[PDB]
Enzyme design. Structure first.
Site, mmCIF file in Angstrom:
data_model
loop_
_atom_site.group_PDB
_atom_site.id
_atom_site.type_symbol
_atom_site.label_atom_id
_atom_site.label_comp_id
_atom_site.label_asym_id
_atom_site.label_seq_id
_atom_site.Cartn_x
_atom_site.Cartn_y
_atom_site.Cartn_z
ATOM 1 N N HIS A 52 6.318 -12.507 -13.126
ATOM 2 C CA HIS A 52 6.179 -13.404 -14.283
ATOM 3 C C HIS A 52 5.057 -12.944 -15.224
ATOM 4 C CE1 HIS A 52 6.790 -17.684 -15.905
ATOM 5 N NE2 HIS A 52 6.074 -17.014 -16.789
ATOM 6 N N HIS A 65 3.825 -12.020 -19.536
ATOM 7 C CA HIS A 65 3.956 -11.886 -20.985
ATOM 8 C C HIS A 65 3.125 -10.702 -21.416
ATOM 9 C CE1 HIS A 65 5.490 -16.072 -21.244
ATOM 10 N NE2 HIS A 65 4.620 -16.283 -20.272
HETATM 11 O O1 LIG Z 1 3.204 -17.112 -23.519
HETATM 12 C C1 LIG Z 1 2.587 -18.178 -23.729
HETATM 13 O O2 LIG Z 1 1.920 -18.398 -24.772
HETATM 14 C C2 LIG Z 1 2.671 -19.239 -22.679
HETATM 15 N N1 LIG Z 1 1.562 -19.719 -22.096
HETATM 16 C C3 LIG Z 1 1.622 -20.675 -21.151
HETATM 17 O O3 LIG Z 1 0.551 -21.085 -20.649
HETATM 18 N N2 LIG Z 1 2.795 -21.202 -20.736
HETATM 19 C C4 LIG Z 1 3.981 -20.817 -21.235
HETATM 20 O O4 LIG Z 1 5.052 -21.317 -20.828
HETATM 21 C C5 LIG Z 1 3.995 -19.767 -22.272
HETATM 22 F F1 LIG Z 1 5.148 -19.325 -22.814
HETATM 23 ZN ZN LIG Z 2 6.269 -20.785 -18.432
HETATM 24 ZN ZN LIG Z 3 5.337 -17.562 -18.771
#
Ligand SMILES: O=C(O)c1[nH]c(=O)[nH]c(=O)c1F
Ligand SMILES: [Zn+2]
Ligand SMILES: [Zn+2]
Ligand SMILES: O=C(O)c1[nH]c(=O)[nH]c(=O)c1F
Ligand SMILES: [Zn+2]
Ligand SMILES: [Zn+2]
Lengths: 343, 343
Positions: B13, B15
């Protein structure tokens, strides 16, 4: 559009800070309110009559020409505080009330309270001379969850205290729970409470949903909706022992908007109109003046103000910021539109 | 002092953003993890194979020489998304999983989901081809309190979905409640979950007690202690369908520390050591490798990594900040000491 005429109100819960900020912030109160309970939580805190008399004067120095404002001074309760010192200041009319901030065994005796059982002597003196006790009702043990701290304070400190000292006049300051609302609602004539505009206007979702918002972060902390609704119903009821206390707690923007933002709302500039909105929304403007202008005076045993101010339902933009010597102050509801305003 | 040898872990998980931040942040993952589930929540989001293939390449461009890293791409589920598009990307090995972000009727069809019943066709396709569904389990109706949104999602969306689609493989991402912990614990082999380091390490008191702390603010939001303890017990149990997902969600410091701070933790740099601390604290290091290195691969149906990394219990200072083209990134546990570190 709609005009609303009420008595000159009072703020029965206020932080005015010191130094260059004291100068910045006093005008926002002194322009509108006749009297205000100034808190003693400075650095160092106000625990002597000398400090209090002196601080009172500094406030008066900050008051614009023409403003008829009277700061009602309070004393910070500590373990080292001498009952005779508080008794003297009350007799001389320096202290109006004494403020109890949360207990903590580690707290240095010069700066606060270790336990309520420790400062019984001064509390017993306050009872004798009929001096009101103001209370920040939160238990601050690490194990206790932040949203439970007000509720816990009622069980383990407040009720036992008020039973021990049946004759003590207690203001349960800035209540934020249904628990506290009920407690005060069903209490006797010696128990009262103040409520902030933010605790009526918002709940914790407003602070957290769609981003963290430090300018709504204060203490006690915004609780969930069912608690918000309790407060609005209590004031709307017409209950005559809740009254206006803003808990205007101004911090510089760089302090609020940081990796560790401070607790407090600079609401003084927008509070009155904000309250007036909530009372209108609750169809309870008949009880508005009372909340502002009467109930506090009636509890403290002081004469009510003899002058009047007007509010107008002309929509007004709130300032994005107020200039400080260094940094700025972001006011409560900065850049927002408000329904009510002073003429 | 103590050495800990485990398999090269994966982050199921993650980003990684885009542009100049993508470059800044990839090295922190690619240096340590063999594979990572990269999320599709960009602007615009990743909803085509072209966007995904392209984005994958941009990630590979950001990977330092010598780093053996493989970004596992996912697809953002929307109402307009064509099942054939997702089916094609899965067949071609572009998409590993599809991510379902919270539903909302107002959401534009190009950018998200209105309801789970609306995107049934693509979900039914995902079932047929045996494609895993990743889920941000929160109901985002305004009336629902923020701390209740994960719990509500289980009743009104998750359970009904999994009953409707009995054969669908679902990862309940970054669970943060006892409710979710139990749900997954008692679920079948097609239900799994990831858990972040912050949701094991802290609870909401850490974010709010003694100041508001935006760098611990994310979603789902840190719940109260009893939920924290549930998560730590679940991973310590040895349950083989929880696995490492950091939800490393980096935002520039000026964005986190503002009047409205964004949700997300940049934990990638400190996560592994942080996890290793919690497993040690729970006397459960025997299940540590599994959580990192095995359980995720085992659920996704991929081969486990064949190389090994070492951790050392030499205490190490975390960086106060990381330099960005403009502004900086405050990492998770910035300036703090950590017990475990990679050699
Ligand atoms: O990528 C983010 O900004 C982000 N940050 C989070 O804390 N929860 C999320 O679901 C999310 F998409
Ligand atoms: Zn999330
Ligand atoms: Zn996430
Ligand atoms: O004056 C402050 O900083 C302050 N702010 C708060 O929000 N609550 C307090 O109890 C307090 F003393
Ligand atoms: Zn207070
Ligand atoms: Zn206060």
């Amino acid at each position: 559009s709609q005009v609303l005429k009420i008595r000159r109100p009072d703020d029965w819960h206020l932080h005015l800070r010191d130094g260059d900020m004291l100068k910045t912030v006093v005008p926002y109160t002194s322009e509108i309110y006749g009297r205000a309970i100034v808190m003693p939580n400075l650095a160092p805190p106000v625990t002597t009559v000398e400090a209090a008399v002196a601080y009172r004067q500094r406030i008066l120095d900050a008051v614009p020409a023409g403003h008829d404002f009277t700061p009602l001074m309070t004393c910070y309760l500590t373990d080292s505080l001498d009952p005779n010192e508080l008794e003297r200041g009350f007799n001389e009319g320096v202290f109006t009330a004494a403020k109890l901030y949360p207990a903590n065994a580690s707290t240095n005796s010069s700066h606060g309270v270790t336990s309520v059982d420790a400062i019984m002597p001064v509390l017993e003196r306050m009872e004798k001379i009929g001096m009101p006790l103001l209370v920040h009702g939160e238990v601050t043990h690490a194990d206790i969850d932040i949203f439970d701290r007000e509720a816990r304070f009622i069980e383990s400190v407040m009720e036992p205290l008020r039973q021990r000292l049946t004759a003590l006049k207690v203001v349960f300051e800035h209540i934020t729970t249904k628990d506290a609302a009920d407690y005060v609602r069903d209490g006797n004539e010696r128990l009262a409470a103040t409520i902030t505009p933010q605790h009526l206007m918002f709940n914790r979702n407003h602070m957290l949903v769609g981003g963290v918002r430090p300018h709504l972060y204060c203490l006690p902390i915004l609780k969930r909706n069912i608690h918000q609704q309790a407060l609005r119903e209590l004031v709307a009821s017409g209950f005559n022992r809740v009254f206006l206390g803003t808990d205007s707690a101004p911090h510089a923007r760089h302090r609020k908007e940081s990796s560790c933002g401070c607790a407090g709302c600079f609401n003084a500039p927008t509070a009155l109109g904000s309250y007036a909105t909530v009372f209108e929304e609750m169809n309870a403007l008949q009880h508005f003046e009372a909340f502002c202008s009467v109930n506090g005076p009636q509890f403290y045993g002081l004469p009510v103000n003899d002058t009047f101010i007007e509010l107008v339902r002309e929509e007004q933009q709130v300032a994005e910021s107020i200039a400080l010597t260094d940094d700025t102050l972001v006011p409560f509801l900065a850049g927002e539109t408000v329904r009510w305003s002073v003429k």
